[PDB]
Structures are given as structure tokens and as C-alpha cells.
Amino acid sequence: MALNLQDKQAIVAEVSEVAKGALSAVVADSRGVTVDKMTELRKAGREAGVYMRVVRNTLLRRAVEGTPFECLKDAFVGPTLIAYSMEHPGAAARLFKEFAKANAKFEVKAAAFEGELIPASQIDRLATLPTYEEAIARLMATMKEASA
Amino acid sequence: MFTINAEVRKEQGKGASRRLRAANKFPAIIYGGKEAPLAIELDHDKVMNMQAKAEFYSEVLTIVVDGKEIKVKAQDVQRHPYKPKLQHIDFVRA
Amino acid sequence: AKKVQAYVKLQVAAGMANPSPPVGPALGQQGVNIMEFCKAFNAKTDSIEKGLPIPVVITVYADRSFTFVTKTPPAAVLLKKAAGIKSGSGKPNKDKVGKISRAQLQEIAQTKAADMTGADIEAMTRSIEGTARSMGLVVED
Amino acid sequence: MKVRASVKKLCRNCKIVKRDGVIRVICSAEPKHKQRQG
RNA sequence: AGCCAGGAUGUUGGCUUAGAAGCAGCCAUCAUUUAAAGAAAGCGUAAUAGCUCACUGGUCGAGUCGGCCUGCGCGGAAGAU
Numbered sequence: 001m002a003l004n005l006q007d008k009q010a011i012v013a014e015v016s017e018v019a020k021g022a023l024s025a026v027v028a029d030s031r032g033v034t035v036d037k038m039t040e041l042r043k044a045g046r047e048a049g050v051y052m053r054v055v056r057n058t059l060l061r062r063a064v065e066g067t068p069f070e071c072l073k074d075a076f077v078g079p080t081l082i083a084y085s086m087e088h089p090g091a092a093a094r095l096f097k098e099f100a101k102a103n104a105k106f107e108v109k110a111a112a113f114e115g116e117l118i119p120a121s122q123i124d125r126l127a128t129l130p131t132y133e134e135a136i137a138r139l140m141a142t143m144k145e146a147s148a
Numbered sequence: 149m150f151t152i153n154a155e156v157r158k159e160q161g162k163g164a165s166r167r168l169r170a171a172n173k174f175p176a177i178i179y180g181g182k183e184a185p186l187a188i189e190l191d192h193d194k195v196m197n198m199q200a201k202a203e204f205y206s207e208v209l210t211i212v213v214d215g216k217e218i219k220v221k222a223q224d225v226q227r228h229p230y231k232p233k234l235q236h237i238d239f240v241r242a
Numbered sequence: 243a244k245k246v247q248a249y250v251k252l253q254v255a256a257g258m259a260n261p262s263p264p265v266g267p268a269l270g271q272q273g274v275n276i277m278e279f280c281k282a283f284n285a286k287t288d289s290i291e292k293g294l295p296i297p298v299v300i301t302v303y304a305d306r307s308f309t310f311v312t313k314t315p316p317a318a319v320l321l322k323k324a325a326g327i328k329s330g331s332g333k334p335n336k337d338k339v340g341k342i343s344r345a346q347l348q349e350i351a352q353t354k355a356a357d358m359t360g361a362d363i364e365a366m367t368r369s370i371e372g373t374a375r376s377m378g379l380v381v382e383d
Numbered sequence: 384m385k386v387r388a389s390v391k392k393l394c395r396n397c398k399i400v401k402r403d404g405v406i407r408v409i410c411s412a413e414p415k416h417k418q419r420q421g
Numbered sequence: 422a423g424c425c426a427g428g429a430u431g432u433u434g435g436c437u438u439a440g441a442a443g444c445a446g447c448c449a450u451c452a453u454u455u456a457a458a459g460a461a462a463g464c465g466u467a468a469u470a471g472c473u474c475a476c477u478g479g480u481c482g483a484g485u486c487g488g489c490c491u492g493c494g495c496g497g498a499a500g501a502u
């Protein structure tokens with residue numbers, strides 16, 4: 001631990017992502033291994049690049065320190081170990097769905113999917129944020145509904 | 149800026165000094181300029197913790213006696229021969 | 243990938259999957275089959291390149307039939323066939339004599355970007371710098 | 384057992400314990416390191 | 422302080438040696454991925470391997486560390502009617 005000019009930077013990045021972000025999920029790395037975070041590394045890298053950062057910050061004065069500003073409901077998501085996956089450009093694209101599918105491979109746990117603060121709820125694994133660019137499914141029935 | 153507190157010595161001598169030292173105090177004196185040498189006692193622990201740092205002795209210090217600040221500089225100091233203790237101190241007016 | 247058996251990586255010959263002295267029977271004997279190393283590994287080897295060291299990892303448990311898997315080349319050996327001096331030093335580590343290229347060390351690390359944590363593409367090249375300076379090879383940037 | 388006037392911790396494992404008014408060094412690791420004061 | 426994790430790379434640093442891969446030595450004691458990881462403190466070996474440790478991240482949730490001055494006590498402390 002350094003003094004105060006070192007912890008505040010962790011909180012600075014945390015508050016920057018918490019406020020300037022989007023849908024995010026939770027990954028309770030009670031016993032993190034080498035390939036768990038690696039698979040999540042590829043998972044987040046597909047998100048446009050390096051903006052889906054996930055560090056092992058579960059402290060009340062680290063990750064809960066940036067709760068007062070934005071995401072003011074992480075006090076209940078601040079106990080034992082909660083790796084907040086704050087997002088960045090875009091939307092909820094697949095972080096929730098990908099996390100559910102990765103957490104279902106016995107990768108450590110996620111505190112029963114505690115959840116971040118997008119909606120007006122707490123814990124609800126929704127699949128209504130996958131498709132957000134598709135614009136070619138409305139051009140498949142035009143050359144089959146003309147003869148008849 | 150070190151600020152020492154002190155009292156004027158009623159009785160001076162060998163026995164008196166010994167008594168002071170027994171009672172966690174120790175004598176000291178101020179001298180310099182036109183003014184007459186002023187004998188005072190000091191609480192020992194405070195001043196030992198003080199004189200530990202080196203700046204005590206280089207810088208100017210303020211002695212409070214009878215509610216009056218005298219600015220002095222530590223000139224000389226008697227130490228106990230085989231203990232981390234102060235027998236006596238010389239202060240010069242500054 | 244979430245679980246692993248076991249694995250014995252070793253720089254084997256691509257050109258012909260049939261070595262005696264280097265590996266041969268030591269490349270698999272504990273339930274591994276040496277006859278299934280020259281009917282399937284070569285199948286996925288006439289579509290890329292053949293002749294340089296190609297580590298292999300065999301997925302044999304006890305069911306006698308395994309699933310051969312691929313891997314990647316070493317980054318430390320990437321400054322030998324794609325930089326300059328093959329040895330890399332020549333002399334004890336006291337006097338810098340090695341060298342690298344400035345146009346390089348960016349596209350040679352993109353080939354092995356399947357084993358880099360750096361989520362940025364340029365973040366993978368900064369780790370190459372340290373691996374390219376193992377001895378202290380000073381480059382002409 | 385060593386029984387000494389001067390008993391000491393000889394390694395990280397060595398621990399000092401008084402039992403029945405006797406300073407004793409007992410070491411989890413090294414048997415040689417167990418001591419007694421006498 | 423325990424408790425759960427890591428304790429990596431170049432690398433097994435080179436030699437001289439029979440071998441030397443942290444651990445026979447002799448010597449340099451550097452750099453990388455950085456949360457952190459000693460060219461290595463102990464065990465271990467044919468030597469690797471393997472088992473710890475250093476530091477560090479998590480849990481926990483109030484005191485904690487070891488010097489100084491002095492008081493009283495403990496051991497050191499075995500003899501012959």
C-alpha cells in the first residue's frame with residue numbers, strides 16, 4: 001500500500017468507469033486462477049478493444065469508494081469479493097449474456113449474479129441486449145411473395 | 149521552532165541539583181548580552197526527546213519562564229557519563 | 243478451454259512426424275499413440291507451414307484415442323529467424339552486441355496474438371520490447 | 384535436549400515457552416533446537 | 422496474527438564440474454508480465470523434479486509492534502553426622 005496518491009487512482013479509474021459506462025456485471029473471484037481471467041480477457045477484448053476492464057477490487061474504500069457518485073447501489077454488492085465489470089462505448093452488448101455463459105462453466109462464481117445498476121431492478125439475467133445492429137433480416141421476404 | 153518551558157531555580161548548588169535530577173528535572177542556565185545569567189530548571193523527558201533531533205541545537209529555541217519568551221541557542225550540554233541523560237545545559241541569548 | 247489433463251510440449255519436427263532420437267517414443271507412451279501422430283497432425287500441417295519447431299500437446303486420457311491440438315511458436319526465438327543473430331548473444335551478458343529492427347517487432351507479435359493478454363493490439367508489442375531486450379539488444383528506433 | 388544457562392531462539396520455528404517456572408525453547412521444525420534453562 | 426490465492430518470464434544466468442537446473446561453489450545480483458513474485462531464505466535431489474518462505478491480493482474488523490527508562494521477582498544455583 002503506498003499512501004493516498006496511489007489508492008485514489010484506483011478509485012479514479014473506478015469512478016470513471018462507474019459513471020462513464022454502461023451495463024455491467026459481477027464476477028466473484030474467490031479463488032481466481034490463470035485461465036478464468038484469460039477467458040474473460042478474450043471475452044472483453046471482443047468488446048471493441050480495451051474498455052471492459054475487470055480488476056479484483058472488492059474493498060469498501062476501493063470499489064465501494066466510487067459508489068457515492070454513480071452506481072449508488074453497490075453497498076450490497078460490496079461484500080466478500082465483487083469484480084465489477086463496468087462497460088464503456090456502446091451498450092449492454094453481450095457482457096451479461098457472455099458472463100452468464102462463462103459463469104455457467106464452473107468459473108468461480110458471481111455472488112449469484114448480483115448485478116450492476118442499469119434498470120430499476122437488482123438481479124435479472126436478461127437476454128434483451130444481444131442484437132443492436134441487425135438490419136438485414138427485413139430483406140429476406142421480397143423475392144418470394146411476388147408470384148403469389 | 150522548539151518551545152521549552154522552564155521555571156526559575158530557587159535554590160542552587162550540589163544537593164539542590166541532585167534533587168532536581170532525582171525529580172525528573174534538571175538544571176540549565178541562560179546567559180548572553182547585557183542581561184544577567186538566568187538559572188532555570190527543565191523537565192527532563194521533554195527536553196531529552198527534544199535534543200534527540202539535530203535541529204534542536206542548530207536552530208533558535210524559545211524558553212518560556214514566568215510567562216516570557218526568551219530566544220536562546222543551545223551552546224553546551226552536560227550529559228550523564230553512561231546514561232542517555234542530561235546533567236545540565238548552557239543556553240546563550242539569541 | 244476450462245479444464246486440462248496433462249500435456250507434454252516439445253519442439254518436434256513438422257516436416258515429418260516420425261522422430262526417433264529427439265522424441266520418438268518419448269512424445270507419447272502413457273496411453274498416447276505414436277501411430278495417430280502421423281495421420282492427423284500432418285493433415286493440419288500441409289495447410290500452413292512445415293519444418294520449424296512445432297510444439298504439440300496430445301489429449302490422451304486412457305481411451306487410447308486422443309485429440310491432437312495445436313500451439314504457437316516462441317516469442318524469444320522470434321528474434322532469431324526474423325531479427326538477426328540466431329544465437330542472440332554470443333558472449334557473456336556484459337557487453338551489448340545484439341541488435342533488432344524498428345520496422346519489425348510489431349508485425350511479428352501480431353502472428354502470436356492468440357496467447358497475449360494485452361487487450362490492445364499495441365499493448366502486446368510493448369511486452370515484446372522486454373522479450374527483445376532479454377540480453378539488452380539495443381534497437382535503432 | 385540442551386539444558387543451558389543461555390537459551391535462545393535458534394530459528395524461525397523456535398518458540399520460547401515457560402512451563403512450571405522453566406524457560407524452554409520448543410521448535411516445531413528441528414528437534415536439535417529444543418532447549419531448557421539449567 | 423491466522424485464514425483462501427498466487428509465489429511467474431529472459432532462465433536451467435554462465436562456468437568448473439562428474440553433474441549444478443535458486444540452493445557444490447565463484448560471481449554478476451540484472452532486467453521483463455507488474456498486484457507481486459529473491460538469478461533466491463530453508464527443506465529436498467543424482468540433478469532436475471517436488472515442498473515451503475520472502476514480498477502481494479482477498480477475508481476479517483480494533484488495536485498492534487519493539488526499543489528506552491526504572492521497581493519487584495525467575496533461571497544460572499552441586500557436598501559430605
